[PDB]
Amino acid sequence: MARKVTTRWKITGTLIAETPLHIGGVGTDLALAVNGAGEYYVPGTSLAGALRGWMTQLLNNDESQIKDLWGDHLDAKRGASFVIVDDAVIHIPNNADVEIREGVGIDRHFGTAANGFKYSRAVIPKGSKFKLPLTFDSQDDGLPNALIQLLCALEAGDIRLGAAKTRGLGRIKLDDLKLKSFALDKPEGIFSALLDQGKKLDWNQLKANVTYQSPPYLGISITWNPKDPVMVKAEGDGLAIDILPLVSQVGSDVRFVIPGSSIKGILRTQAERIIRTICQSNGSEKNFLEQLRINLVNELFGSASLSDLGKIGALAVNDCFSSLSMTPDQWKAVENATEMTGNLQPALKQATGYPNNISQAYKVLQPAMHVAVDRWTGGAAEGMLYSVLEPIGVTWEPIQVHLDIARLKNYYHGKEEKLKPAIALLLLVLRDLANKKIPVGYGTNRGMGTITVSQITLNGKALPTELEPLNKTMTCPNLTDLDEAFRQDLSTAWKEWIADPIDLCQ
Amino acid sequence: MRGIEITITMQSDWHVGTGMGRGELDSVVQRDGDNLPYIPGKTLTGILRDSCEQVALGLDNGQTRGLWHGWINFIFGDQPALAQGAIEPEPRPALIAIGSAHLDPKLKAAFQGKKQLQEAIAFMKPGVAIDAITGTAKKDFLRFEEVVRLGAKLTAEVELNLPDNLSETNKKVIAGILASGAKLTERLGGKRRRGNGRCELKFSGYSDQQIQWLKDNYQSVDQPPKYQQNKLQSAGDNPEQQPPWHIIPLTIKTLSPVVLPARTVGNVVECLDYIPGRYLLGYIHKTLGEYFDVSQAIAAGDLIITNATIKIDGKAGRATPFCLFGEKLDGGLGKGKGVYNRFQESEPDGIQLKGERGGYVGQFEQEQRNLPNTGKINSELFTHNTIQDDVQRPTSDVGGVYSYEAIIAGQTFVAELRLPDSLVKQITSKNKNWQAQLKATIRIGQSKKDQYGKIEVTSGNSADLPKPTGNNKTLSIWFLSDILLRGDRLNFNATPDDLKKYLENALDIKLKERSDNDLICIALRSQRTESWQVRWGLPRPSLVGWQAGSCLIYDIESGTVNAEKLQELMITGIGDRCTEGYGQIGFNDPLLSASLGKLTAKPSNPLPTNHPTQDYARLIEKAAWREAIQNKALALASSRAKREEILGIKIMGKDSQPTMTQLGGFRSVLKRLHSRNNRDIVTGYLTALEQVSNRKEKWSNTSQGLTKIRNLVTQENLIWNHLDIDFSPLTITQNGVNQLKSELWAEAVRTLVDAIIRGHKRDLEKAQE
Amino acid sequence: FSVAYTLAERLIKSAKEVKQKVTVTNSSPITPFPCSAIDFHILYDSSGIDFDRIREKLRPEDNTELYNRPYVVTAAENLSQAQGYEWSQAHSLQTLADRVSYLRSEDGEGKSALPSSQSHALRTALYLEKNEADAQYSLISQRYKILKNFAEDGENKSLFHLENGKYVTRFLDALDAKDFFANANH
């Protein structure tokens, strides 16, 4: 006989990239996984580990329940996985291609691009689709709870795929989920498997009939607007405009983007600055890698895997896209524009959606000239004339920050009392973000990058009772919407850690 | 019923593994004798069997043993290694032989000579374990697996040797099961559960019609019929044997690997380097058994089929004489020098000698003045597993894996069928063209139903009989085959005085050992043969004697030696089981008489355009070209002079010409170059650069970069001149180069420009660091 | 293990070729000079299982050997008075262990100084015509400068050096033996 299967489940749907995605291949970070046809794809090994990884965090590392689904080469009773995860070709939407994210580390002393810390990453664009390609062999007459929980997590968008998960990327969501049952224990089900494409299950029934359980996390959704123009710089100069906003493909459109790499790094910088102040510790002597290694920031933001102190960040930040979008050729018309008062004005009128109103167009995207003035003569230091397309009236989607509370617990060894100094730092950083102390993107000392924060929504799932006061929507920048007994509670654990700034992580 | 095929179409990248990696690779795929990926027939039977067992479970309502599971043991044979206790029925063989699945022969013909493309059929897949705590790549769990590109269409020859009395309804049951089990197969090979090896498996001539018939009829099937052997039959009507003998040469070519068990030892079978004559007996029955009573001839000794030994000089290679010795440091037949015939040559002064052992030698003559040509048989070790079906993995390395040595395909062997004139007259009277019937393709030996045993047999024109020189001074004996002799108690034996007695009786002479001290008289080695007897159902008795290559020379003490009798012994063989090629003997051969110490040894197709695999070939081509372009680009871009040569950009001490924002600006334009039709966007951008001085002046400190960029984009040839790749090793499609150049032009340009800009900015930073 | 030992016999017979190459100066008759040597094989799946087939599979052209064996284990100091001293250094095991160290070594990123993807491309190149093999070696060593240490011609432009009229290379030995120098005596 073969392996005895009671019901085979074909479990299918469309996984959509909710952020860009990068899954790497052998052949800096410009090699994306490609199948033998050279098409970009999700390897089933990489999707399985995402799904298996999530279930492992769900089930508190109960290895037995995991190995009962995902298999085990060691246990004499187990062997092969009962989940099959197929490879899925990525359908990048029309008029879109792989993008390259260019970035840099910022020296914490000088505040400038650290030498030797430039990086490039190729990313499958947002809105790209690939099949959910799952088969489950059941050896009993049901469907496993943890597998139902996994499918709920996929529909919730809770599972991350690929690289740079904490720093902009990896978010996927499942749609069109279909479950097909084949009773391979029975003749009708085997011939159905051969001929009839299976008994349909309404997912909405089972999805209603059990409570979805996430592992602990705190969602932070920051509703913000540019107080002054906020952009990341595009790496290439335009023809009419030197400094252009970074755009990214989002479905069939392009949108302006602030990478979650940029928001992560500014938040990390403020975290590290607060700790070094409390310790009065100087990072002027240290090199960039040394400047980053500090307590409580190495867990919320991660440490590089150097042989190991490497850690993934418990805190993950999405790429934030503008509410404005453009057709790809509309933005190319702006990029190609050769004359600021020539063909740029049509192109900007089109892209902002105000083809007949140059006033309303420039209330969204404003070209700005900058000139350096000679101190001795008072003349424009010509050659030091440059132009910026300032997104003065670009509206942005809320910044999505995800604190993996389960990740912090593993770092702190399950004891949630250690969480409070990390939570305290995170709230102190959000207090600075809400008080305009953390500018974002290009040109922050040069008239750009200050943001208003209207609202911080803290959305904890499965939080411990002592952090349950975090489930709040804040509109005071100083966090007085958080219970004062809870803020005093955090403040006491914070002050205790300050007294002995030890490494929680033991 | 051969002529059925299975087609496998690989729908995802696929990995039939070898259980190991090599060097930088942690897993490598199996490759056939052409170095191409394939699915071995043992893998293909296992996957197809497993799926027919999935169907059987459904039809048996989950009963693990039952009527429909018995149908799998009918179709695929019993699995006696798993059964325990007193199973009384003999194990059923399979009704289905499934070959290995190979790529289309024209596609494999295209790959001949193109080692770079042969590697390009596969690519590296990374695998890494992530630490569940830190979420980081767990180092030394970084792993690279070779996987074969999807789109492969592979085909295996299938033979259904159905029982000749099988009911027409039961034929439809077998066809129905196989169609059904083929349909249910979705995966094969390594990492099935993680998306490798997705496939469609289709029999030729089995469709949903065969599935639908079973669905309509399965409830009224019964147990399959009981297995019985095809028994021998004998009439006894053969004529008595009369000289002359006829020697019919048989050329055997290996088409698959062939396992010819030398010794079976736990989970490994070692293979011979020759085909024993007993493997051809079933072919002799099948082809000639209607013309005379073959079994009677065997019993009477009217039939000899020799061993098939490697063809050398156009003849059967002869087992290297053990009387030959090499100089231990610098000589031997493999080194082609320092080979002494110790029957004739003293051991040299101060030089120690190693006896020769294996291999085969070509023809030799008394005054050849060159060493005889050597022949070598290429054998490879093949490794297989059994999957324990509940865990779907091998149950351990020790008892889950097994290995066969096999003689690899493409090797040529010569046997001889020898028949007396009595039978040849009878055969020719019944069929004048009977030698035409000796041409056949047959599967021989161990595991012959799977990936093993496929041989072509061809018959040659009747050979001349051996003509040994009758010398009354000495008798020289060369064992061309293993000699099996009964002792005087009819046990098998290793006493050469019995062979001395046997010869002098058989020749009616008297023999004496060669008495010199500086020479050797006797060079035998023992041989033990541990075969099966398939008709017995039980092992054959162990046969002991002397291995081929064993040599001895005698002085004739008295009596003339009859050249006619030496010829007859050289035909019939001596000792036991000569009918199947034991006992083959060379008398008075010049190679055993020579002094040799001074001698030395002598010194693709392009794929048709309409061909169905052209889509798959084009896949391998594009991969090979893309990797060549990208590697050559990264070589070029690594050097400051070539970056300036191709794009004019240069580093002047510490600042780049032009600034990186001009390179980023251009690079953000060139990414819109999807095809040659888009090139006006790129040359359009260059116009607007050079249209205005403020832009023009930034590039004007380059080495003419804006013209160089315009040339690279406007001239379809220029990218290929800069890359300067020879794409002839990387193409196999007819007109492939022209089609691939037009298809990959925009990508190759984009690849090179991006590489140059990257290399420039890497050095620019290195100048600033 | 039957077959494996038969190969170890043929490997030691190969290792003993030091007896012809490394000899006591002015000895009459020529005598071998005490020189330890190793020959080894790792039995990868399609590598052959008998010595002559193994080595034949490593001769992609009759001018070329993808092996540089045996490896001398005697220290270079103790051989200096022998004939064939220069031969012993071309065949020194230390030369293999160095090349294996370079393959195992890492860059400042903690990535390998030669990636597997490039190692595998060099494995493929070694089976090409020597001008194609040397062309590939030029391209990859422009990009990964650690490969200069793997050059053997002294002109720093080939993985092969000429030896008794054959082009031979240590590089495939290093790729194969990469994981077989484990030690644990540091």
The backbone torsions φ and ψ at residue B539, rounded to the nearest 5 degrees and listed phi first, read -70, 155
Dihedral sign computed on CA atoms, order A236, A240, A245, A247: negative
d(CA B486, CA B577): 11
Contact A59, A150 (CB under 8 A): no
Q: Is A392 left (phi over 0), alpha (psi -120 to 50) or beta?
A: alpha
Tokens linked to C67: 């092996």
- Tokens 């070959």 found at: B99
Q: Is B22 within 8 Å of chain C by CB?
A: yes
d(CA A226, CA A228): 5
How many angstroms away from the CA of B36 is the closest CA of chain C? 12
The answer to whether the annotation marks B26 as part of a ligand binding site is: yes
d(CA B342, CA B518): 8
d(CA B292, CA B285): 9
d(CA B225, CA B214): 18
- Tokens 């081929």 found at: B548
d(CA B245, CA B465): 8
d(CA B690, CA B698): 10
Contact A481, A473 (CB under 8 A): yes
- Nearest C-alpha neighbor of A500 from the set A296, A214, A227: A296
Q: What residues in A contact B62, CB-CB < 8 Å?
A: 4, 6, 185-186
The contacts of residue C74 (CB under 8 Å, 6+ apart) are C34, C35, C36, C37, C88
- Cis peptide, bond prior to residue B244, ω within 30 of zero: yes
Cα distances (angstroms) measured from residue B234 to each of B237, B294, B295, B437, C11: 8, 8, 6, 21, 54
Question: Which H/E stretch holds residue C6?
Answer: helix C2-15
Could you tell me which chain A residue has the CA closest to the CA of C121?
Answer: A27
Q: What residues in C contact A27, CB-CB < 8 Å?
A: 117
The contacts of residue C156 (CB under 8 Å, 6+ apart) are C148
First to last CA, chain A: 52
Nearest 5°: the CA angle B445, B447, B449 is 100
d(CA B393, CA B402): 14
- Nearest C-alpha neighbor of B62 from the set B71, B72, B73, B54: B54
Neighbours of B766 (CB within 10 A): 11
Q: What residues in B contact A195, CB-CB < 8 Å?
A: 208, 211-212, 215
Tokens linked to B713: 């984009």
Neighbours of B91 (CB within 10 A): 14
Exposed, middle or buried, B31 (CB in 10 Å: 0-12/13-18/19+)?
A: buried
d(CA A37, CA B618): 9
Neighbours of B537 (CB within 10 A): 10
- Nearest C-alpha neighbor of A24 from the set A170, A174, A173: A170
Task: With CB atoms and an 8 Å threshold, state whether B631 touches C140.
Answer: yes
- Tokens 């004996």 found at: B477
Dihedral sign computed on CA atoms, order B508, B514, B519, B521: positive
Q: How many contacts does A have with B, using Cβ atoms within 8 A?
A: 218
How many angstroms away from the CA of C125 is the closest CA of chain B? 8
d(CA C80, CA C88): 9
Neighbours of B489 (CB within 10 A): 7
Tokens linked to A379: 């003349």
Contact A130, A91 (CB under 8 A): yes
Could you tell me which chain A residue has the CA closest to the CA of C115?
Answer: A26
Type of residue numbered B407 = I
- Nearest C-alpha neighbor of B565 from the set B527, B509, B603: B509
How many angstroms away from the CA of C107 is the closest CA of chain A? 12
d(CA C185, CA C31): 35
Greatest alpha-carbon span in chain B: 115
The contacts of residue B700 (CB under 8 Å, 6+ apart) are none
- Nearest C-alpha neighbor of A136 from the set A178, A185, A81: A81
- Cis peptide, bond prior to residue C70, ω within 30 of zero: yes
Q: What is chain A's length?
A: 506
The backbone torsions φ and ψ at residue B172, rounded to the nearest 5 degrees and listed phi first, read -65, -30
d(CA B433, CA C73): 67
- Tokens 């059925």 found at: B4
d(CA B657, CA B660): 8
Contact B71, A3 (CB under 8 A): no
d(CA A66, CA A52): 7
d(CA A211, CA B420): 88
Contact C96, C173 (CB under 8 A): yes
3-state secondary structure A130-165: EEEEEEEEECCCCCCHHHHHHHHHHHHCCCECCCCC
Tokens linked to B298: 């065997």
Cα distances (angstroms) measured from residue A65 to each of A6, A105, A147, B129: 19, 41, 11, 19
Greatest alpha-carbon span in chain A: 95
Tokens linked to A219: 């969602």
Of the candidates A6, A118, A307, the beta carbon closest to that of B139 is on A307
Contact A455, A227 (CB under 8 A): no
How many angstroms away from the CA of C45 is the closest CA of chain B? 6
Tokens linked to A450: 């200050």
Neighbours of B10 (CB within 10 A): 25
DSSP 8-state class, residue A258 = E
- Tokens 């970074």 found at: A246
Of the candidates A1, A80, A133, the beta carbon closest to that of B53 is on A1
Residue C156: CA atoms inside 13 Å, Cβ hemisphere, count? 7
Beta bridge partners of A222: A399, A456
Contact B420, B241 (CB under 8 A): yes
Could you tell me which chain B residue has the CA closest to the CA of A6?
Answer: B62
A170 Cα distance to chain centroid:
6
Instruction: Compute and round to an integer the Cα radius of gyration of chain A.
Output: 25
Question: Which H/E stretch holds residue A424?
Answer: helix A419-434
Beta bridge partners of B586: B478
Q: What residues in A contact C115, CB-CB < 8 Å?
A: 26
Q: What residues in B contact C54, CB-CB < 8 Å?
A: none
B104 Cα distance to chain centroid:
16
d(CA B299, CA B302): 8
Q: What is chain C's length?
A: 186
d(CA B53, CA B70): 10
Neighbours of A4 (CB within 10 A): 16
- Nearest C-alpha neighbor of B55 from the set A1, A40, C144: A1
Instruction: Compute and round to an integer the Cα radius of gyration of chain B.
Output: 34
d(CA B579, CA B560): 28
Q: What is the DSSP string of B262-292?
A: EEEETTEEEE-SSB-GGGGHHHHHHHHTTTS
Neighbours of A24 (CB within 10 A): 19
A residues 217-276 lying closer than 8 A (beta carbon) to C: none
Beta bridge partners of B246: B419
Question: Which H/E stretch holds residue B722?
Answer: helix B718-723
Task: With CB atoms and an 8 Å threshold, state whether A79 touches B392.
Answer: yes
The backbone torsions φ and ψ at residue A278, rounded to the nearest 5 degrees and listed phi first, read -55, -35
Tokens linked to C132: 């194609």
d(CA B303, CA B291): 13
Residue B560: CA atoms inside 13 Å, Cβ hemisphere, count? 4
DSSP 8-state class, residue A405 = H
Q: What residues in B contact A194, CB-CB < 8 Å?
A: 55, 180, 183-184, 208, 211, 215
- Tokens 């020769």 found at: B356
Task: With CB atoms and an 8 Å threshold, state whether C117 touches A26.
Answer: yes
Dihedral sign computed on CA atoms, order A163, A167, A168, A170: positive
Tokens linked to A435: 């008080």
- Cis peptide, bond prior to residue B80, ω within 30 of zero: no
Beta bridge partners of A472: A458
Beta bridge partners of A88: A42
d(CA B322, CA B524): 7
Q: Is C111 within 8 Å of chain B by CB?
A: no
How many angstroms away from the CA of A187 is the closest CA of chain B? 5
Q: Is C117 within 8 Å of chain A by CB?
A: yes
Dihedral sign computed on CA atoms, order C55, C57, C59, C65: negative
- Tokens 């013909």 found at: B109
Q: Which residues of A contribute to the annotated binding site for Mg(2+)?
A: 242, 385
The contacts of residue B741 (CB under 8 Å, 6+ apart) are B716, B720, B727
Contact B317, B309 (CB under 8 A): yes
Preferred mutation among B54, B686, B743 to probe A, highest tally of A CBs within 10 A: B54
Question: Which H/E stretch holds residue B184?
Answer: helix B168-184
Q: Is B665 within 8 Å of chain A by CB?
A: yes
Strand order in the sheet with A172-182: A83-85, A129-138, A7-17, A172-182, A199-201
d(CA A47, CA B194): 8
The answer to whether the annotation marks B140 as part of a ligand binding site is: yes
Tokens linked to B582: 């034991």
The contacts of residue A358 (CB under 8 Å, 6+ apart) are A345, A349
The backbone torsions φ and ψ at residue A417, rounded to the nearest 5 degrees and listed phi first, read -70, -30
d(CA B105, CA B503): 52
Nearest 5°: the CA angle B376, B381, B384 is 155
Task: With CB atoms and an 8 Å threshold, state whether B195 touches A85.
Answer: yes
DSSP 8-state class, residue A329 = H
First to last CA, chain B: 75
Packing angle of the helix pair B614-637, B640-647 (nearest 10 deg): 110
A residues 3-42 lying closer than 8 A (beta carbon) to C: 26-27
Contact A402, A382 (CB under 8 A): no
Neighbours of A466 (CB within 10 A): 16
d(CA A423, CA B267): 60
Instruction: Compute and round to an integer the Cα radius of gyration of chain C.
Output: 17
Preferred mutation among C46, C53, C140, C181 to probe B, highest tally of B CBs within 10 A: C46
Contact B595, B369 (CB under 8 A): no
Of the candidates B19, B23, B627, the beta carbon closest to that of C119 is on B23
Nearest 5°: the CA angle B501, B507, B511 is 50
Q: What residues in B contact A406, CB-CB < 8 Å?
A: none
How many angstroms away from the CA of A72 is the closest CA of chain C? 26
Task: With CB atoms and an 8 Å threshold, state whether B124 touches C116.
Answer: yes
d(CA B726, CA B746): 18
A290 Cα distance to chain centroid:
25
Question: Which H/E stretch holds residue A225?
Answer: strand A217-226
Of the candidates B22, B329, B632, the beta carbon closest to that of C19 is on B329
Task: With CB atoms and an 8 Å threshold, state whether A305 touches C110.
Answer: yes
Of the candidates B215, B661, B769, the beta carbon closest to that of A236 is on B661
d(CA B104, CA B96): 22
Q: What is chain B's length?
A: 769
The backbone torsions φ and ψ at residue A209, rounded to the nearest 5 degrees and listed phi first, read -80, 5
d(CA A335, CA A331): 6
B residues 613-632 lying closer than 8 A (beta carbon) to C: 627, 631-632
Neighbours of A341 (CB within 10 A): 8
The contacts of residue B582 (CB under 8 Å, 6+ apart) are B277, B481, B482, B483, B484, B543, B545, B573, B575, B576
Resolution in Å equals 2.5
How many angstroms away from the CA of C142 is the closest CA of chain B? 6
Exposed, middle or buried, C46 (CB in 10 Å: 0-12/13-18/19+)?
A: middle
Q: Is C113 helix (H, G, I), strand (E, B) or coil?
A: coil
A residues 5-34 lying closer than 8 A (beta carbon) to B: 5-6, 24-27
Q: Name the H helices within C16-115.
A: 18-21, 51-57, 76-79, 85-90, 93-104
Task: With CB atoms and an 8 Å threshold, state whether A235 touches B668.
Answer: yes
The contacts of residue A10 (CB under 8 Å, 6+ apart) are A134, A135, A178, A179, A180, A182, A198
Q: What residues in A contact B768, CB-CB < 8 Å?
A: 115
Tokens linked to B265: 């030892």
Of the candidates C3, C44, C139, the beta carbon closest to that of B20 is on C44
Dihedral sign computed on CA atoms, order A25, A26, A30, A36: negative
Q: Name the H helices within B14-114.
A: 41-59, 67-75, 105-110
Beta bridge partners of B483: B546
Task: With CB atoms and an 8 Å threshold, state whether A36 touches B144.
Answer: no
- How many helices and strands, by DSSP H and E, does chain B display? 20, 36
B533 Cα distance to chain centroid:
27
- Tokens 């993807």 found at: C117
Packing angle of the helix pair A344-351, A328-336 (nearest 10 deg): 150
